[PDB]
Amino acid sequence: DNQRIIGAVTRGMIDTMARSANGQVGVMKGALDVTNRRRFDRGENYEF
Amino acid sequence: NPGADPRAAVHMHTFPEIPQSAQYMINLQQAEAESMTGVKAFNAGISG
Amino acid sequence: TIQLKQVIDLLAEGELSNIKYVNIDTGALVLERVPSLIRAINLGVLDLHKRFLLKEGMLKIQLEEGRRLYPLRPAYQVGQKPKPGVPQFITEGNKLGRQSILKIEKIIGDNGVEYYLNDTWQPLNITTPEFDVLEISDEFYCHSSSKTLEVRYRRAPTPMKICVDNLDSWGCIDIDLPYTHLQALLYFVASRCQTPIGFMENTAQEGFNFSQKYEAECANLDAQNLRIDPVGNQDRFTRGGWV
Amino acid sequence: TIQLKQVIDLLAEGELSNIKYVNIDTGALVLERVPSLIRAINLGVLDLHKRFLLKEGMLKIQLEEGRRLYPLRPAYQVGQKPKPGVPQFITEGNKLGRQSILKIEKIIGDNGVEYYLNDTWQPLNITTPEFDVLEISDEFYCHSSSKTLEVRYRRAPTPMKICVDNLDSWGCIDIDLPYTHLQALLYFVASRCQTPIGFMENTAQEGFNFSQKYEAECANLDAQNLRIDPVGNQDRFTRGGWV
Amino acid sequence: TIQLKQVIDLLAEGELSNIKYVNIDTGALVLERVPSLIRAINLGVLDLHKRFLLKEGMLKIQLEEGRRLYPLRPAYQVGQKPKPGVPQFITEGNKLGRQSILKIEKIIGDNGVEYYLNDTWQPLNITTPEFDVLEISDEFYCHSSSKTLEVRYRRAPTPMKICVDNLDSWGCIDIDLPYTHLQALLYFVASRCQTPIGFMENTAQEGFNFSQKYEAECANLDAQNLRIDPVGNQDRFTRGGWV
Amino acid sequence: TIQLKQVIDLLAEGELSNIKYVNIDTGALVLERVPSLIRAINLGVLDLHKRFLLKEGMLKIQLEEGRRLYPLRPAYQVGQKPKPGVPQFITEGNKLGRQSILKIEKIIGDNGVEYYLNDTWQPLNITTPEFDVLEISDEFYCHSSSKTLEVRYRRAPTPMKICVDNLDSWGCIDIDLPYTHLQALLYFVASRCQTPIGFMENTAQEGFNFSQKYEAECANLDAQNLRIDPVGNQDRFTRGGWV
Incomplete structure (x- = not known):
């Protein structure tokens, strides 16, 4: 029983951390125009 | 111009914040491996 | 789940009494715009079936290897009219009509498995x-092991056909x-x-008031x-591991 | 997913009863502005297909090395009119019309890979x-290993063509x-x-009221x-490493 | 991305029916203010292309050492009219018109490098x-190693030319x-x-109402x-160091 | 960056149709208040150039030791009229007009250095x-090492001159x-x-409404x-020390 429970809990924690959306970045529509969007992607200063 | 204080008008992006769970998960995995093998390796930190 | 049309019209007299549909100004008695009344009532029934389940149906599709699209239309259903260009593969279930499939909900194979719907x-x-067609990929045939399917879906009833000779009774519907x-x-x-009638201050708002009362009644129901409401209680304990 | 035009007009009688479109003042019977009514109904259908998916299509493009622009127009599609100046490279899929491509969504190669769309x-x-043209860079040809493509896109139906002789029936549409x-x-x-009619206080607001009810109904749907709604469940566990 | 003018005018009949533009008071039929209608429609199209991308173009400039200003005008473009005082250095791309360049966005050299625009x-x-001219400093020539440039920009279509003899059809545009x-x-x-017409309480607000609906529709789109929307995914891992 | 005056007037017909400027009450056709219309349009263009950059210019001043004030006026510019009392020291740049200098922005010497403007x-x-004059102190001459200057500034175009004989065409402007x-x-x-016309309730607000729409459009642009928008990215790493 202890082995089964520990396995279940560990699998649950792995699933929670893995099926998440870590790494992606989201931007509100209409906050940046096309040119400023390109600058922001390029990695220089921009305006919002 | 008035109505736009600099502390909100300008913004300097920095690294995001790592959540407190990745640290715990790494520690858990390393401790489990050490327990399984039986050699502490004086590791997961300063070799001393 | 049935009601005589007679009772419906007699009651709707009590709320359409203001207007042309049901009353001569003298000796208020039902006119013969009954066709238009029926056409409105059918739309009302369809709307109610949209808002609440109240029904559900079942089919049974017999698979055919190499097929890509299975439409669910009343020309492929057993007992319907066998159009020569189509093979009749729907072999069992409620008789299909023009408005019967509001939404497909469950797909169960012959083995008791439960497949996934629109879960990429x-x-x-x-x-x-296309909302009434099943697209089956080839990987399904590769790992199917199932020779038939069972489909469940949200239904709406098929309205009864009125006829010019049937204008005699109209009360058996x-x-x-x-x-x-x-x-x-x-x-x-x-x-x-009542919406498109009236030009006085208080008589121009009856349609709006009735719409408000309709919404309130739906909320009360x-x-x-x-109405029907399934609630799920999975096991989670027989997978092997959660115990 | 079909409805007889007859039923539609009979029902729209119940809400256009105030105005010229459908009624003689005496003995209210449908006029012959049916062409204009059809032209309005087609626009309505297009708008609904904009708001909800309700459909999706498929093509199949046969690649040609060294090509830069592939337009998707009904002159390049097999079974259409073969304009001599163009080679017909769209070899399979739903018949293309003037308004069929609302948006391209997925591109799948012959190997099962999934390419990226507008992801710089x-x-x-x-x-x-240009919203209906695929621009394929040379690096794609350098590392493609795919001789064909499959495209999926959001569709809108092609309206049926009314004709002056077809004014006889108009009910088979x-x-x-x-x-x-x-x-x-x-x-x-x-x-x-109903928008451009009326000069009385309560009769000048019917168009606005109907717009409000239209929005409310869309929200309720x-x-x-x-409507169709795919939901994604990636694996994330077969890449090698997340287990 | 095309539509017959015929359909446009037939539909706009349904919303301009109140006024002079399209209707005789008796037997409502389109007048011959079609020139003014077209001049309005072109402005509308330009506005929509301002609000959404919907298009993008490409050029190719052949550099010339020691030059300071490169204007992008339809006299320097190959296949246009070769004005003697100018050398035709724009050797490839979409045909340039009076309103084609809404904004320059990308500049890519022959080596695949990507230069900077207005980044001091x-x-x-x-x-x-001057919004349609490229100023190239001498340090660019000092360290260029590129004999040509490729330019991308936000486009707007060139309207078709109506003619007094073309008043015959106007439906092929x-x-x-x-x-x-x-x-x-x-x-x-x-x-x-509809803005500049009407003197009654409810008829003086139609222009305002249509403006509101126009804004709402743009928001819905x-x-x-x-519309087209690139989204950037840089590498950041091949510079050497981030791994 | 040009537009034919013809198109402008034809379009402004569609919004000035209410009033005297463009219409005979019968057979609405443009009058001959075109001079006043042009005088208004020039002011509009100047205002737009105030609100957005859209342009920038360049000069080149040849210094003279011991001089204190350098005015930038079209009498000192090469190619202009050489007033005898003034030496023509502006030797290169866009032709200067009465309204060309909206604001001086940058001053760059012959060595590539960048001087400071109004930074005490x-x-x-x-x-x-005096907003169009450069005051150069003697310390500048003491430590200058620069024999010339380059000036950049925000421009506004010079309107074309209409003439009584030019009233023939007015469409080549x-x-x-x-x-x-x-x-x-x-x-x-x-x-x-439209501001100074009208005495009815709804006709007394057209000027205000158009002002509101003008502001909204400027915000949308x-x-x-x-419009042009430089964005600064200094180095900060070559001064010696920040690395």
């Missing part, structure tokens, strides 16, 4: 490209509703009929919970 | 310069919609037709979820 | 002094738009035409995401 | 006492604007012309970012 990247996904939603349907029909 | 700096990116969005389409058409 | 103090910066932005264009044109 | 107590500060700001200029002109 799932193991054996089934996609509906049976609307398909529980009585609760009858009380609601009255308000629906009254609003729809939801609160009283007089 | 991604490995093998495909760019749409079939609108392409589920019945739910029929109930919504009624309000759309009523608002559009969204809430009831009577 | 950046290594190899390119400045636009083709607006360059997807159908969605057609539905929006209708409201734009209706507002513009933005929400539905029916 | 800075090493080599240059002061503008070219306004200097991109088309976007044309759409805005329409509202500006309409508001200015700002949001869409259809």
Whole structure:
């Protein structure tokens, strides 16, 4: 029983951390125009 | 111009914040491996 | 789940009494715009079936290897008219009509398995490209092990056909509703009929008032919970590991 | 997903009864502005297909090395009219019309890979310069290993062609919609037709009221979820490392 | 991305029916103010192309050492009229018109490098002094290693030329738009035409109402995401160091 | 950046149709108040150039030791009229007009250095006492090592001169604007012309409404970012120490 429970809990924690959306970045529509969007992607200063 | 204080008008992006769970998960995995093998390796930190 | 049309019209007299549909100004008696009344009532019934489940159906599709699209239309269903260009593969279930499939909900194979619907990247996904058609990929045939399917879906009844000779009785027609939603349907029909009439201050708002009462009644039915509502209780303990 | 035009007009009688479109003042019977009514109904159907998916299509492009722009127009599609100046490279899929491509969504190669659409700096990116054209860079040809493509896109139906001789029946025409969005389409058409008429206080607001009801109905359909909605469940566990 | 002018005018009949533009008071039939209608529709199309991308173009400039200003005008473009005083250095790309360049966005050299635009103090910066001219400093020539340039920019279509003899048909002209932005264009044109007419309480607000509906429709299109939208995914891992 | 005056007037017909400026009450055709219309349009263009950059210019001043004030006026510029009392020291740049200098922005020497403008107590500060004059202190001559200067400034175009004989065509005149700001200029002109007319409740507010729409359009252009906008990226790493 202890082995089964520990396995279940560990699998649950792995699933929670893995099926998440870590790494992606989201931007509100209409906050940046096309040119400023390109600058922001390029990695220089921009305006919002 | 008035109505736009600099502390909100300008913004300097920095690294995001790592959540407190990745640290715990790494520690858990390393401790489990050490327990399984039986050699502490004086590791997961300063070799001393 | 039936009601005589007679009772419906007699009651709708009590709320359409202001207007042309049902009354001579002298000796108020029902006219012969009954066709238009029926055409409105059918729309009301369909709307109620949209808002609450009240029904569900079943089919049974016999698979055929190498097929890509399976449409669910009343020309492929057993007992219907066998159009020569189509093979009749729907072999069992409620008789299909023009408005019967509001939404497909469950797909169960012959083995008791439960496939996935519109859940992309799932193991054996089934996609509906046109809301009444099943698109079955080849990987399904590769790992299917199932020779038939069972489909469940949200239904709406098929209205009875009125006829010019049937104008004699019109009272043997049976609307398909529980009585609760009858009380609601009255308000629906009254609003729809009363909207385009009247030019006085208080008589120009009857349609709006009836719409408000209709919404209130629908909310009350939801609160009283007089419709079907499945609630899921998985096992989670027989997978092997959660115990 | 079809409805007889007859039923539509008979029902729209119940909400256009105030105005010229459908009624002689005496003995209210449908006039012969049916052409204009059809032209309005087609626009309504297109709008509903904009708001909800309700459909999706498929093509199959046969690649040609050294090509830069592939337009998707009904002159390049097999079975259409073969304009001599163009090579017919679209070899399979739903018949293309003037309004069929609302948006390209997925591009799948012959190997099962999934390419990227308008995702700059991604490995093998495909760019749409003009919303109906695929721009394929040379690096794609350098590392493609795929001789064909499969495209999926959001569709809108092609309206049926009315004709002056067809003014006889007009009732065999079939609108392409589920019945739910029929109930919504009624309000759309009523608002559009009733807007430019009336000079009295309460009669100058019917168009606005019908617009409001149209929006409310669209919201209700969204809430009831009577349209297609894929939901993604990636694996994330077969890449090698997440286990 | 085309539509027949015929359909446009037939539909705009349904919203301009109140006024002079399209109707004789008796037997409502289109007048011959079609020139003014076309001049309005072209403005509407330009506005929509301002609000959403919907297009993008390409050029190719052949550099010349020691030059300072490169204007992008239809006299320097190959295949146009070769004005003697100018050397035709734009050797490839979409045919240039009076309104084609809404904004320059990308500059890519022959080596695949990507130069900077209006980013002061950046290594190899390119400045636009007059919104349609490229100013190239001498340090660019000092460290260029590129014999040509490729330019991308936001486009707007060139309207077709109407003619007094062309008043015969006017139905072969083709607006360059997807159908969605057609539905929006209708409201734009209706507002513009209806603004300066009417003196009654409810008839003095039609222009304002149509403006409101136009804005609402633009917002809905933005929400539905029916326009082009690149999204950047840099590598950041091949510079050498981030791994 | 040009537009034919003809198109402008034809479009402004569609919004000035209420009033004297453009219409005979019978057979509405443009009058001959075109001089006043042009005088208004020039003011509109100047206002738009105030609100957005859209342009920038360049000069080149040849220094003279012991001089204190350098005015920038079209009598000192090469190629202009050489007034005997003044030495012509502006030897290169865009032709200067009465309204060309909206604001001086940058001063760059022959060595590539960048001097300071109106920054008191800075090493080599240059002061503008009268908005079109450069005051150069003697310390500048003491430590200058530069025999010439290059000036950049925000420009506004010089309007074309209309003439009584030119009243023949008036259609070869070219306004200097991109088309976007044309759409805005329409509202500006309409508001200015419609303000001082009308005595009825709804006709006394057209000027105000057009002003509101003008402001809204300017805000929309700002949001869409259809004007020039430099953005600074200094080095900060080559001074010696920040690495």
